[PDB]
Write a protein that binds this DNA or RNA. Structure first.
Ligand SMILES: [Mg+2]
Ligand SMILES: [Mg+2]
Ligand SMILES: [Mg+2]
Ligand SMILES: [Mg+2]
Ligand SMILES: [Mg+2]
Ligand SMILES: [Mg+2]
Ligand SMILES: [Mg+2]
Ligand SMILES: [Mg+2]
Ligand SMILES: [Mg+2]
Ligand SMILES: [Mg+2]
Ligand SMILES: [Mg+2]
Ligand SMILES: [Mg+2]
Ligand SMILES: [Mg+2]
Ligand SMILES: [Mg+2]
Ligand SMILES: [Mg+2]
Ligand SMILES: [Mg+2]
Ligand SMILES: [Mg+2]
Ligand SMILES: [Mg+2]
Ligand SMILES: [Mg+2]
Ligand SMILES: [Mg+2]
Ligand SMILES: [Mg+2]
Ligand SMILES: [Mg+2]
Ligand SMILES: [Mg+2]
Ligand SMILES: [Mg+2]
Ligand SMILES: [Mg+2]
Ligand SMILES: [Mg+2]
Ligand SMILES: [Mg+2]
Ligand SMILES: [Mg+2]
Ligand SMILES: [Mg+2]
Ligand SMILES: [Mg+2]
Ligand SMILES: [Mg+2]
Ligand SMILES: [Mg+2]
Ligand SMILES: [Mg+2]
Ligand SMILES: [Mg+2]
Ligand SMILES: [Mg+2]
Ligand SMILES: [Mg+2]
Ligand SMILES: [Mg+2]
Ligand SMILES: [Mg+2]
Ligand SMILES: [Mg+2]
Ligand SMILES: [Mg+2]
Ligand SMILES: [Mg+2]
Ligand SMILES: [Mg+2]
Ligand SMILES: [Mg+2]
Ligand SMILES: [Mg+2]
Ligand SMILES: [Mg+2]
Ligand SMILES: [Mg+2]
Ligand SMILES: [Mg+2]
Ligand SMILES: [Mg+2]
Ligand SMILES: [Mg+2]
Ligand SMILES: [Mg+2]
Lengths: 227, 46, 33, 122, 95
RNA sequence: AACUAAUCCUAGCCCUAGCCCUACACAAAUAUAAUUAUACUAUUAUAUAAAUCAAAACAUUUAUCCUACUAAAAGUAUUGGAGAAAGAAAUUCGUAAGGAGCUAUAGAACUAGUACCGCAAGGGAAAGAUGAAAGACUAAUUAAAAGUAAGAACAAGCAAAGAUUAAACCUUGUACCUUUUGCAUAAUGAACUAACUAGAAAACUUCUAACUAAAAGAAUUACAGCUAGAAACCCCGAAACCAAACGAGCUACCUAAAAACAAUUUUAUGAAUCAACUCGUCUAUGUGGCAAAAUAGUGAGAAGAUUUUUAGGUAGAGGUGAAAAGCCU
RNA sequence: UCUCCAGGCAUACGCGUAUAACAACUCGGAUAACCAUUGUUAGUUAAUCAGAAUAGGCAAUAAUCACACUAUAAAUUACCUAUAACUUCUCUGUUAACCCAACACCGGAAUGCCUAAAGGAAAGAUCCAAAAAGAUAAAAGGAACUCGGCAAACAAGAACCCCGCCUGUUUACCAAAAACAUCACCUCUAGCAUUACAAGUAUUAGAGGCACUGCCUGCCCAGUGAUCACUUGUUCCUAGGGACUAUGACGGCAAACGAGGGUCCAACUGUCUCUUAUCUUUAAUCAGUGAAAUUGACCUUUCAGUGAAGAGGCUGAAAUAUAAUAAUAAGACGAGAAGACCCUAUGGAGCUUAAAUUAUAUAACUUAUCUAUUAUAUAGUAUAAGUUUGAAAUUUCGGUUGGGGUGACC
């Protein structure tokens, strides 16, 4: 009887009501422990493909206007409503984004380096080595999947030929084509790691059930009389 | 606490748990009815 | 366990007199001789 | 402790449970919950004029009863259809194609009262 | 022992007797001596001679073996050139 | 000099024989929360049976279970921790309505899969008795069971026996079954009445006959044997194990939609005092109780990780668990 | 009419005629009256209470008197564009003292309104014995009681140790705690999308440990020259020759809080010295109704003996009209429960592993098989055969040794 709530085909900026799982799967059995209850929430459909040209428009760099930078219950970072042309779409907000700012979304692969302004989306080839980036996509057109948390910025270590190396926040180096689109700057809510829960009830407000109260080298034969 | 009152009646719950439509939903439930028909039960299901 | 209370039914007259009854008169099929 | 043997009716169960007692529907429920009764769906009692009717509920005990001969298709056919076909055959004005002339109906479609599937109540 | 079989309703022979003992028609049973093929290097010459012999069974042992085998193993067998032809009967036996 | 009771005979049932079946019965309703006249949401068994048990344990294995014609070949060939056990074939033979059964605790569970018990799967009873006629007023028959009544008792004792003129006084006498040990003043079991309630098989031996170097109505045995008859080996009772259904209306946790929190002080709260509400600290009562966990007091929390309501989910090789190996009627 | 008591009326859920009248007086109410019982007849009335056309386009801005006010846990069909139809009221719920607890059960039972205008009766009659239960009063003393201030009090104040940070959570039915959870802190694992984690992305997620804060100190940190050379170290080529090498895992302590476990003082008292009086319950007598465990048979005595710790019943003395009513509990090794304790079974089961036997759970590799390619070759793979890993599965628990370590012994 479990029908997923993620059944909306068409993009909208209206917040969408979420049904909670409880750590259980479509079978009805717990698959992850420690999830339950909490505050009711609404899902605002984020758009991680920064360079999405508007319908019936050409594929070239465009600009959008930041309406508001808002708190999002469903993620560590904060979201910014951005409007351009006749389209409104939620997006992740960088560290310094404010209302009324203008942010560029560029398709052009700069043959030379392009000056980097935080919040604008540029292909990795355009950016210069060393620039802090966020919302990186693995393959051109996929959409952003890495560096999407609060205050998490990766570095662009190297660009050679058609590919570049990205240092993910975990210090794990990844390689992607220079065509991939990465947003510049940090991801905002840099102090999220400084937040203090304080009381056990606060985690029960975020849907975190308490931990359960339940409290390997086989010797080789030649080394069993010394164990 | 005092036990013995584990039955909290509800017609919606009863017909959903042990009703005609529920029994026919799975083949094992159909065989529940087949046994009771063979035995001669006056009540096949709730 | 227990056994059921069967009510366990010159006697019909008392039965119907206590209960009360509509005894419609009957036409005797054979005339009395 | 629920009673499994008594009949399930609308008096039992919560308010949400409702079901009919066997009365035929006479209308339709539109959206926003408006009942619209349909005049044609409501039965009409066709009552004849009984003025000057000689038949009453009971019959004379002196009236002889008749031997039972339940009606058969052959008896109906002979009483009604045989006289025409027999006379027509002698006249020679007979063919298989013109069976409608004697009262045959190839199909029941288009008739107000269809003999099969029956589309009228008693 | 199987006294009444499921298929035939009879007793069954214990095929461990059939593979170890010979029954003479008179009623006697022959056997070998346990260990006659074992560790012969450390056995005395007289001991080995005793082991090689064919030996008879006691009254109770014979009574047991008769219980464990069926009648077919107790019939008189007319084998041409039998080397036990003369041992199937008792002679000069008053007892 | 009689109450409670007792007597009873047929309702049906049992095993065979024979036989393929063509019983699947008005109108209407019903797969919707079945039995609700019409659209909405469409509809669909199962991969190898397992274990108990036998092997005096158990670990390969363990007849039937898991069917292919009778009698013989034959418990033979074979198969097997070569143990317990298991076990063929070639080949031959083959033309056919009844009861030394039951008669109401028996025979079917059956007067009924009902009443009743259980959320459900499921479990599952008891009983009737006139006569030709009841349009003869529903009879009779029986010192007859235990139990009582008619009719309490009268120094002294396993309750009787020997006796006696005499019921009791006198004399003699350590209840029963099993069990200890072949003993108990041990110890188990027994309120009493009626009914019901536990030894079953033919390898060898013995006995009685038929025929006899042969016996047997084919297949077998035989150096007096062979054929037939007769003669035999209990009842009740676990914790367990496995397969398939049924269960989350209790309880554990969860999902969705809803509710409740006065007054007072702090502040801006898993803060304070204290109701409603939730819980169950200590003592007494109760202990077949009002209650298979309560009552009366006294207490802990009481805007929160609070409490409560409704509907849904997770199922036993599992579920749930702020782990008590708690909870899952 | 009087005396007294103080959760009542609606709806939901549930129940299913217990509703009302009459007639009955068998059964049912634990007894009567009377009926909640039996039979017969009746009943609940709704257009407002309650239940039961199609296709597109699009949504930033809580609630709390919503203004101010901040906040954090971030929080409810409409309006438009076209199409289609162009006057309608049937059906069903409606009673009651009611449901779940085997019962007319001192229990359980959601919400709104209200707190006596609604709803009710603690005593069948009598008697005031013991023992038992409950309430109130106490001369003088005031914990001397007791395992302990348990219980009670005209008291309800003050402090100190131990443990746990704190509010929370648990062994429904003997354990509410020092156990569990908890913010904080710490270790480990994972670089990723269309059903959990999650419509998330390392400031994330999962697994697990652990009080925090401040304070302390172990490890570890090539050696000597001094950013430089040797000695080392590690590899090779043959004892030679090259090659290469620029900070902590541990303790010690912090207030507040606690139906936790110890302790003290003050006050207070019938806990006690040392009990008493009153009232209610029960008791007892009268009327009605009427169980339960238990029971070999009993015409059921005391003392000494005998006996296995043991005698109403045996041996020898002794005592002895018969039956009730109300009391006590020495005995009938008094009666009950699934209570305890040791031992036994080639009886079980739960749990753990380093028991034996297995293990197409996952994971990996290897060879085939089948495709792609390629110069032989690297890829993959509806399967088979190996190997490695081990989630699991099945089975077992020799003997002798006041009983338990080890040993030993057969
Ligand atoms: Mg823990
Ligand atoms: Mg029950
Ligand atoms: Mg409930
Ligand atoms: Mg065995
Ligand atoms: Mg086995
Ligand atoms: Mg019977
Ligand atoms: Mg019967
Ligand atoms: Mg008598
Ligand atoms: Mg005497
Ligand atoms: Mg004893
Ligand atoms: Mg076993
Ligand atoms: Mg539930
Ligand atoms: Mg308040
Ligand atoms: Mg508080
Ligand atoms: Mg309090
Ligand atoms: Mg408090
Ligand atoms: Mg819990
Ligand atoms: Mg524990
Ligand atoms: Mg249970
Ligand atoms: Mg009434
Ligand atoms: Mg009356
Ligand atoms: Mg009545
Ligand atoms: Mg309405
Ligand atoms: Mg009403
Ligand atoms: Mg009672
Ligand atoms: Mg009043
Ligand atoms: Mg009263
Ligand atoms: Mg009184
Ligand atoms: Mg006082
Ligand atoms: Mg005093
Ligand atoms: Mg003292
Ligand atoms: Mg002291
Ligand atoms: Mg106290
Ligand atoms: Mg604590
Ligand atoms: Mg607490
Ligand atoms: Mg407890
Ligand atoms: Mg609890
Ligand atoms: Mg507590
Ligand atoms: Mg407790
Ligand atoms: Mg702890
Ligand atoms: Mg406490
Ligand atoms: Mg003092
Ligand atoms: Mg009396
Ligand atoms: Mg006496
Ligand atoms: Mg004595
Ligand atoms: Mg004496
Ligand atoms: Mg008395
Ligand atoms: Mg006594
Ligand atoms: Mg033994
Ligand atoms: Mg065993």
């Amino acid at each position: 009887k479990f029908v997923s709530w993620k059944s909306r085909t068409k993009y909208t900026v209206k917040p969408v009501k979420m049904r909670k799982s409880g750590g259980r799967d479509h079978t009805g059995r717990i698959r992850v422990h420690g999830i339950g209850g909490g505050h009711k929430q609404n899902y605002r459909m984020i758009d991680f493909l920064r360079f999405r040209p508007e319908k019936e428009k050409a594929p070239e760099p465009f600009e959008e206007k930041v309406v508001v930078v808002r708190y999002d219950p469903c993620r560590s970072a904060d979201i910014a409503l951005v409007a351009g042309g006749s389209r409104k779409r939620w997006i992740i907000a960088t560290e310094n984004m404010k209302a009324g700012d203008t942010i560029l979304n560029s398709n052009h692969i700069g043959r030379m380096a392009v000056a980097a302004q935080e919040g604008d989306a540029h292909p990795l080839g355009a950016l210069p080595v060393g620039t802090l980036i966020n919302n990186v996509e693995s393959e051109p057109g996929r959409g952003a999947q890495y560096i999407r948390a609060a205050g998490t910025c990766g570095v662009l270590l190297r660009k050679v030929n058609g590919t570049a190396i990205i240092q993910l926040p975990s210090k794990r180096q990844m390689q992607v084509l220079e065509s991939c689109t990465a947003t510049v700057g940090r991801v905002s809510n840099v102090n999220h790691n400084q937040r203090v829960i304080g009381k056990a009830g606060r985690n029960r407000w975020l849907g975190k059930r308490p931990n359960s109260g339940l409290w390997k080298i086989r010797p080789l034969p030649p080394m069993k009389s010394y164990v | 606490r005092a036990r013995g009152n584990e039955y909290q009646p509800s017609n919606i719950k009863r017909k959903h748990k042990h009703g005609w439509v529920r029994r026919l939903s799975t083949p094992a439930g159909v065989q529940v009815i087949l046994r009771r028909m063979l035995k001669g039960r006056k009540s096949l299901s709730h | 366990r227990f056994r059921p209370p069967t009510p366990e039914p010159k006697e019909f007259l008392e039965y119907a007199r206590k209960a009360g009854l509509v005894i419609p008169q009957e036409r005797l099929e054979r005339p009395i001789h | 402790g629920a009673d499994r043997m008594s009949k399930w009716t609308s008096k039992r169960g919560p308010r949400t449970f409702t079901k009919s007692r066997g009365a035929k529907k006479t209308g339709i429920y539109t959206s926003d919950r408006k009942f619209v009764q349909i005049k044609e769906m409501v039965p009409e009692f066709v009552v004849p004029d009984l003025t000057g009717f000689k038949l009453k509920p009971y019959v004379n005990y002196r009236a002889p009863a008749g031997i039972d001969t339940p009606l058969t298709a052959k008896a109906l056919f002979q009483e009604t259809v045989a006289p025409a076909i027999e006379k027509d055959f002698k006249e020679g004005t007979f063919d298989a194609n013109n069976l409608e002339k004697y009262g045959f109906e190839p199909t029941q479609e288009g008739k107000l009262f269809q003999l099969y599937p029956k589309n009228f109540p008693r | 022992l199987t006294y009444c079989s499921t298929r035939k309703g009879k007793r069954k022979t214990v095929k461990s007797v059939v593979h170890r003992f010979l029954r003479l028609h008179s009623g006697l049973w022959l056997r070998r001596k346990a260990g006659y093929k074992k560790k012969l290097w450390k056995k005395s010459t007289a001991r080995k001679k005793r082991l090689r012999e064919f030996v008879f069974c006691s009254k109770t042992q014979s009574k047991l073996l008769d219980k464990m085998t069926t009648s077919f193993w107790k019939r008189r067998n007319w084998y041409a050139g039998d080397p036990y032809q003369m041992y199937h009967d008792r002679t000069n036996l008053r007892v």
